[PDB]
Scaffold this active site. Structure first.
Site, PDB file in Angstrom:
ATOM      1  N   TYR B  17       0.714  -1.258   0.000  1.00 24.77           N
ATOM      2  CA  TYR B  17       0.000   0.000   0.000  1.00 24.77           C
ATOM      3  C   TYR B  17       0.715   1.260   0.000  1.00 24.77           C
ATOM      4  O   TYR B  17       0.538   2.053   0.917  1.00 24.77           O
ATOM      5  CB  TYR B  17      -0.440   0.389   1.474  1.00 24.77           C
ATOM      6  CG  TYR B  17      -0.914  -0.721   2.300  1.00 24.77           C
ATOM      7  CD1 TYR B  17      -0.424  -0.961   3.587  1.00 24.77           C
ATOM      8  CD2 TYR B  17      -1.836  -1.562   1.774  1.00 24.77           C
ATOM      9  CE1 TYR B  17      -0.883  -2.042   4.304  1.00 24.77           C
ATOM     10  CE2 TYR B  17      -2.295  -2.620   2.461  1.00 24.77           C
ATOM     11  CZ  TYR B  17      -1.825  -2.868   3.727  1.00 24.77           C
ATOM     12  OH  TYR B  17      -2.313  -3.955   4.399  1.00 24.77           O
ATOM     13  N   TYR B 144     -12.178  -8.192   6.839  1.00 23.51           N
ATOM     14  CA  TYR B 144     -11.074  -8.329   5.879  1.00 23.51           C
ATOM     15  C   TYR B 144     -10.818  -9.807   5.699  1.00 23.51           C
ATOM     16  O   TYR B 144     -10.620 -10.509   6.687  1.00 23.51           O
ATOM     17  CB  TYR B 144      -9.773  -7.667   6.363  1.00 23.51           C
ATOM     18  CG  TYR B 144      -8.686  -7.826   5.324  1.00 23.51           C
ATOM     19  CD1 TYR B 144      -8.806  -7.203   4.085  1.00 23.51           C
ATOM     20  CD2 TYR B 144      -7.572  -8.639   5.551  1.00 23.51           C
ATOM     21  CE1 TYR B 144      -7.871  -7.356   3.126  1.00 23.51           C
ATOM     22  CE2 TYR B 144      -6.622  -8.801   4.589  1.00 23.51           C
ATOM     23  CZ  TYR B 144      -6.765  -8.135   3.373  1.00 23.51           C
ATOM     24  OH  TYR B 144      -5.830  -8.303   2.385  1.00 23.51           O
ATOM     25  N   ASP B 231     -12.712 -17.183   9.657  1.00 22.46           N
ATOM     26  CA  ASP B 231     -11.404 -16.774   9.147  1.00 22.46           C
ATOM     27  C   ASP B 231     -10.483 -16.463  10.325  1.00 22.46           C
ATOM     28  O   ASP B 231     -10.542 -15.372  10.885  1.00 22.46           O
ATOM     29  CB  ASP B 231     -11.561 -15.538   8.252  1.00 22.46           C
ATOM     30  CG  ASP B 231     -10.276 -15.124   7.571  1.00 22.46           C
ATOM     31  OD1 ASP B 231      -9.180 -15.589   8.008  1.00 22.46           O
ATOM     32  OD2 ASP B 231     -10.291 -14.314   6.585  1.00 22.46           O
ATOM     33  N   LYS B 260      -0.638 -16.905   8.447  1.00 14.04           N
ATOM     34  CA  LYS B 260       0.267 -16.030   9.217  1.00 14.04           C
ATOM     35  C   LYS B 260       1.165 -16.760  10.249  1.00 14.04           C
ATOM     36  O   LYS B 260       2.301 -17.137   9.924  1.00 14.04           O
ATOM     37  CB  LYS B 260      -0.501 -14.829   9.803  1.00 14.04           C
ATOM     38  CG  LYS B 260      -1.113 -13.885   8.732  1.00 14.04           C
ATOM     39  CD  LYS B 260      -1.506 -12.511   9.281  1.00 14.04           C
ATOM     40  CE  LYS B 260      -2.097 -11.517   8.230  1.00 14.04           C
ATOM     41  NZ  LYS B 260      -3.165 -12.117   7.433  1.00 14.04           N
TER      42      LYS B 260
END
Ligand code: NA
Ligand code: NA
Lengths: 410, 411
Positions: B17, B144, B231, B260
């Site tokens: 980003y 997200y 999630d 992760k």
């Protein structure tokens, strides 16, 4: 590995393109060295697949091993948000220099599909910044660009032109263009990019088309203002005889996707390169970021893999492999089960008239001391570049034998 | 890393980003050890981020390292098509064993986004198999689920979006359910799955909501026969104070996504687990396979990472981190730039009233010998479980200093 280990795998572990209710045998591998996979039981197998394109320098290569271990001693991972490191810089330098002049901006990612999604998002944001209603992609039928939602939208079931009829080995025929001209004429105004696999359409048919197609597509894109995306995740790093398959048409895309052989097949990594024009238009940011972007370990492995290719030795290795594959697969053109034999670089394809019997042919192959993995009507070889002529000969002997009768077909 | 090296990075390498026309500063890291990042200039920084959730055991961990080096000695990679190997089998054993009972079929993948795409595909293939026209996902605002196109269709803006959970991790307010129930009644016939991040909404705002939401969502899904996708790519492996955040509600989803911290932050790997009913049902009707599926090196790293967790030390490391975060972030409630402070497990969040100035704030943190990476209106901490108290104190003090005035805000 015990048999209780193998029972757990069948009952709980999903494998690529395969049922949880009717899994076929899988073979336990314990190690690999050079061009051989070592099974639990001690059997050594000559690898003909490079673990699906990737392992171009084979396995347990000393230069890849040393580099990965050294990087582990420094740091295996650190986030890329606000941070940079030697492996990522050394890799991106090699990538910018080895690809066409205009491709000088690098977006590293984890997987190929993700690299393709980035490419598509790049083309969408690009046109949006110019204030144009371009959300459509034009691709070929028989194309393959990944597993994810976006990648699936441009896969052989947007706008789909027919698969290229003309061949790499053969002659150019102008009738091939009529469908892509008809589509572009009707849609030049809503088209954001043409996305294609150059020369070799891998997972969608292992087709090899004439380079004039790439020449033609590049000019039409230049003329209409439309972006060209070359998906080289399967073709990059010397597999078709040239460093990148675009070199076969002497053309450069606006966006280039890479993966598979990038790390020498040691672990996953991908990269999407683009032009400054695209990279700057979008920022006027590109909205993307995988958690493990720039992974130092995968970058270090990739740097060492590219360093081996910097010697140039691969050109001769691949050329030699090409001549050996042509010579030794030719006899198959005469077997009753073969429909077509086609070779380009270190890719040898024997296409058949009927589909294969997976469990049976696989066992036959393992019995022959070779690892070869067929799909549909295709028995193909894509060995590591360091394969010895004796080893390559074992692979082609096994393929030629497999298609000798219908024992292994349907 | 020379200056030429640094200049090339700035003109040719995209970073997450961040603009290529107006790039912001980046810091050169040469190595990492323990809970410290080491810059090219020799400065050592205490890491407050765990390289975004993942490095729960810090860096250069001798056990993680030996495990990876040993697997490289055997083979770093081999295809998973028609082949299996010890690292994947050992990993899937641990995954099955540590998650709730019904979750027993494992699909290994490379990245979190792909793991989620796999779950969505599973949900679609499933209803197709039962012959049901089900193509809608119902999700929460502020969610997200990744960066790929399918994952974005359930990221906060065709799917259905219920209001962001209001009740805090706080008493419960039955009114919080109005928006969710309305959607359910109107589209119950068309919903393939409900997909949410349990307890903690990460990238969408680092929000922390009430576990009653999960109990209700599980019950409503049970009642309509709808699939629940949890999630846990961010919340997994101890971060919220329990092994999996679903544990807060003692609920089991139909599909579970992980990533992760799975490898202890050495390299990318992800996994989607589902039930036998789902895997048998997409089987008697799964169309997925990344090239590096089951990568032995990554699986070996995850095995050594899960083995450290097996000791159980994380439970108290996290409990102590939570007490310290709450105590040491409390003073931010007296600062002019703060909108909210909230803590759960080894996650501490200071939400501000104005967006941060990234370049200026990042530099300030580096000067304090800490690595903290804010975003938008959030300054938050997620340190490695092995962080020493004196190290965590350096992080919480830097955060408190940063929010005293306008200096590091807006841009
Ligand atoms: Na270039
Ligand atoms: Na389980």
């Amino acid at each position: 590995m015990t048999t209780d280990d193998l029972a757990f795998d069948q009952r709980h572990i999903l494998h690529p393109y395969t049922s949880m209710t009717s899994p076929l045998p899988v073979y336990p591998v314990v190690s690999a060295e050079g061009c051989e996979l070592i099974l639990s039981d001690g059997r050594r197998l000559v690898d003909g697949m490079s673990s699906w394109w990737a392992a171009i320098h084979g396995y347990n290569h000393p230069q890849l091993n040393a580099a990965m271990k050294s990087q582990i001693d420094a740091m295996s991972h650190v986030m890329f948000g606000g941070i940079t490191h030697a492996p990522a810089i050394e890799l991106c330098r090699k990538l910018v220099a080895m690809t066409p002049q205009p491709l000088e901006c690098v977006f590293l990612a984890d997987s190929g599909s993700v690299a393709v999604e980035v490419a598509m998002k790049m083309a969408l944001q690009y046109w949006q910044a110019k204030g144009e209603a371009r959300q459509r992609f034009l691709t070929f039928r028989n194309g393959y660009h990944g597993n994810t939602f976006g990648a699936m939208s441009v896969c052989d079931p947007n706008l789909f032109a027919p698969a290229p009829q003309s061949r790499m080995d053969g002659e150019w025929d102008e009738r091939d263009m009529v469908g892509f001209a008809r589509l572009m004429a009707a849609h030049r105004h809503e088209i954001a990019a043409v996305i294609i696999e150059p020369i070799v359409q891998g997972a969608g048919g292992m087709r090899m088309y004439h380079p004039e197609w790439l020449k033609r597509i590049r000019k039409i894109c230049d003329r209409e203002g439309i972006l060209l995306i070359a998906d080289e995740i399967a073709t990059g790093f010397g597999r078709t005889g040239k460093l990148f398959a675009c070199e076969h048409a002497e053309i450069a895309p606006d966006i280039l996707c890479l993966g598979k052989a990038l790390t020498g097949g040691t672990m996953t990594l991908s990269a999407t390169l683009t032009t400054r024009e695209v990279a700057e238009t979008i920022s006027n940011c590109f909205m993307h970021g995988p958690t493990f972007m720039g992974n130092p370990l995968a970058c270090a492995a990739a740097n060492a893999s590219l360093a081996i290719l910097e010697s140039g030795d691969w050109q001769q290795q691949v050329a030699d492999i090409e001549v050996q594959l042509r010579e030794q697969l030719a006899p198959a053109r005469d077997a009753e089960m073969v429909a077509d034999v086609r070779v380009l670089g270190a890719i040898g394809v024997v296409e058949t008239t009927h589909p294969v019997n997976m469990a049976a042919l696989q066992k036959f192959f393992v019995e022959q001391g070779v690892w070869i993995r067929p799909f549909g009507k295709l028995i193909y070889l894509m060995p590591p570049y360091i394969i010895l002529p004796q080893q390559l000969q074992r692979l082609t002997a096994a393929v030629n034998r497999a298609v000798q009768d219908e024992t292994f077909f349907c």
